[PDB]
């Protein structure tokens, strides 16, 4: 749990962070879906618990620089990423 | 001067009331927000 891993819940391919969830599934319901109709919460087949299944951190790397005619130092910005995730 | 000042004050109070009561006064900004949201939602839904 809490690690970017490849998860398999009865042939369910995917990759993401498996975190405990507070949602309340119905007994027959196996895996949930979000507004986008994508896999969001999955119930473990062996032990019955509700787990969120977010995807791993992604973003966009932007580079801040003065002109090379001035200097070669750059600063890198990771868009939409908490500083503890790099 | 006093009449004009009183008229201005009353008008500005009525402006606040009219903005507070009528819901469709700010339709343009809400349309902007809704258009952006629905475009993103449609593009996401196209994945399925």
């Amino acid at each position: 749990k809490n690690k970017c891993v490849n998860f398999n819940f009865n042939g369910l391919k995917g990759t993401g962070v498996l975190t405990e969830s507070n949602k309340k599934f119905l007994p027959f319901q196996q895996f949930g879906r979000d507004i986008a109709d994508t896999t969001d919460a999955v119930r473990d087949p062996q032990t019955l618990e509700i787990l969120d299944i977010t995807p791993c951190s992604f973003g966009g790397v932007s580079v801040i620089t003065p002109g090379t005619n001035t200097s070669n130092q750059v600063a890198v910005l990771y868009q939409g990423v908490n500083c503890t995730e790099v | 001067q006093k009449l004009i000042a009183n008229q201005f004050n009353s008008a500005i109070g009525k402006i606040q009331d009219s903005l507070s009561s009528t819901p469709s006064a700010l339709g343009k900004l809400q349309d902007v927000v809704n258009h952006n949201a629905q475009a993103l939602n449609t593009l996401v839904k196209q994945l399925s």
Binding site: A36, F58, G59, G60, Q79, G80 | L19, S20, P23, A25, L26, L29, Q30, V33, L40, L43, V44
Partner: peptide, 20 residues
């Protein structure tokens, strides 16, 4: 008050405090 993946939303350069 009256106004309410692979896709990212970028923040505006001017915060609402600066506009105010």
């Amino acid at each position: 008050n009256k106004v309410t993946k692979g896709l990212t939303v970028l923040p505006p350069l001017l915060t609402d405090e600066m506009i105010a």
